[PDB]
Design a binder for this molecule. Structure first.
Ligand SMILES: O=C1O[C@H](CO)[C@H](O)[C@H](O)[C@H]1O
Ligand SMILES: [Mg+2]
Ligand code: NA
Ligand code: NA
Lengths: 211, 210
């Protein structure tokens, strides 16, 4: 959840908002180790429920998200249903556990390609065109993350937009991402420069991957 | 002496506008068939399966024409080569269907088949079904017959399935055409076509358009 003024500005300037719970357990092995554990349901529940209680009156918020990169655990299904029950006005989405689980109203993959399948075990990223028509599948597809804009990037961006326009159920996506997470450091003369991972003696680090 | 007056054009031509040579005549077989007065007039064969196709029920509905008699029987027998695998015998008289009773001139035979050899384009396993119309005492009146292929075709979850598996149709449309004989088909040309089709990795044909 963002600083509260963000939603005010989105209401007034006009931007659709996905409001997302502060839950990410990416570094767990497997990713859902905590989110499938009932011991962690109370902590997770508050991050979902208290977001809804705060932001439910903002017209800019159109979709609730259960968090990010926390696998798919039973705690997600419980909290999916909680939101559906208290606020039927907004779809609920969540990418973890393969982007098309029982905890999401929207097929919301990250970095699924337009034409190319990436058939990873358990959590495949199908071609978005292919994903829509998998047997029994009927949901809209909106990428929660796509076109990773790291350094000299956005090659193939047009391929996404051609597909979005041709396919009714491909309803777009959210580019990753808006702004480089670089930080200002200063040389001996006080001149500023842009710093990334490892520049603060921080270790281990992931270097330029924050930009 | 038979006399046949064949018209090139009819009201039927309005339903026969296929993209092909427009021809006319007696272009398929002519035959004479002798049936007894008490006869098999129709029969339908169905094969239904359990979830893993390890068990099947062959269901054969048989219809008779002629005088209904208590001594009349139908035996449907199922053969794999020279081995009889299953057999059923019953008198005529179908199940009650409505307020006025059932079909007195029909009978349905049900045969169990354990571990049936399944039919597909990959392995065209066939059984032979013989339908015997006879007296209770065992005098044959007549027999009809057909090749039986045990297979289930269904659409489930948006997929066309044969024997529970999603098909990939390597198909071709085929007209009945011969450069010398027109639209008259012969066994040699049919076989020639099928051999070439399978040799070129086709598994399916559409009877375009008749
Ligand atoms: O649409 C079609 O295209 C073919 C063109 O050769 C042929 O006319 C087929 O009979 C018809 O169904
Ligand atoms: Mg035509
Ligand atoms: Na679209
Ligand atoms: Na990053």
């Amino acid at each position: 959840p963002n600083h509260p003024l963000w939603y005010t500005l989105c209401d007034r300037y006009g931007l659709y908002v996905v409001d997302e719970a502060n839950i990410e357990t990416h570094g767990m092995v497997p990713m859902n180790r905590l989110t499938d554990d009932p011991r962690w349901l109370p902590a997770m529940s508050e991050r979902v429920t208290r977001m809804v209680q705060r932001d439910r009156n903002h017209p800019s918020v159109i979709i609730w998200s259960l968090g990010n990169e926390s696998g798919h655990g039973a705690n997600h299904d419980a909290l999916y249903r909680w939101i559906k029950s208290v606020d039927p006005s907004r779809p609920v989405q969540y990418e973890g556990g393969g982007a098309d689980t029982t905890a999401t109203d929207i097929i919301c993959p990250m970095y699924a390609r337009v034409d190319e399948d990436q058939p990873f075990p358990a959590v495949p990223k199908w071609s978005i065109k292919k994903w829509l028509s998998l047997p029994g599948e009927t949901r809209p597809l909106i990428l929660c993350e796509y076109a990773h804009a790291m350094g000299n990037s956005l090659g193939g961006f047009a391929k996404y937009w051609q597909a979005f326009r041709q396919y009714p159920r491909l309803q777009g996506g959210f580019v990753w991402d808006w702004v480089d997470q670089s930080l200002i450091k200063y040389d001996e003369n006080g001149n500023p420069w842009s710093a990334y991972g490892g520049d603060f003696g921080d270790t281990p680090n992931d270097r330029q991957f924050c930009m | 002496r038979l006399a046949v007056m064949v018209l090139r054009w009819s009201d039927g031509s309005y339903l026969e506008d296929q993209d092909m040579w427009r021809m006319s005549g007696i272009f398929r077989d002519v035959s004479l068939l002798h049936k007894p007065t008490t006869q098999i007039s129709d029969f339908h064969v169905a094969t239904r399966f359990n979830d893993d196709f390890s068990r099947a029920v062959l269901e054969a509905e048989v219809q008779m024409c002629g005088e209904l008699r208590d001594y009349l029987r139908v035996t449907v027998s199922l053969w794999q080569g020279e081995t009889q695998v299953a057999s059923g015998t019953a008198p005529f008289g179908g199940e009650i269907i409505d307020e006025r009773g059932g079909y007195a001139d029909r009978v349905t035979l049900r045969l169990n088949v354990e571990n049936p050899k399944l039919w597909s384009a990959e392995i065209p396993n066939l059984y032979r079904a013989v339908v015997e119309l006879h007296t209770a005492d065992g005098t044959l009146i007549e027999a009809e017959a057909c090749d039986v292929g045990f297979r289930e075709v269904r659409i489930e979850n948006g997929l066309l399935l044969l024997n529970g598996k999603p098909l990939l149709i390597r198909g071709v449309n085929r007209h009945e055409h011969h450069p010398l004989h027109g639209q008259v088909m012969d066994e040699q040309t049919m076989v020639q076509d099928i051999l070439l089709m399978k040799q070129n990795n086709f598994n399916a044909v559409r009877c375009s358009h008749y």
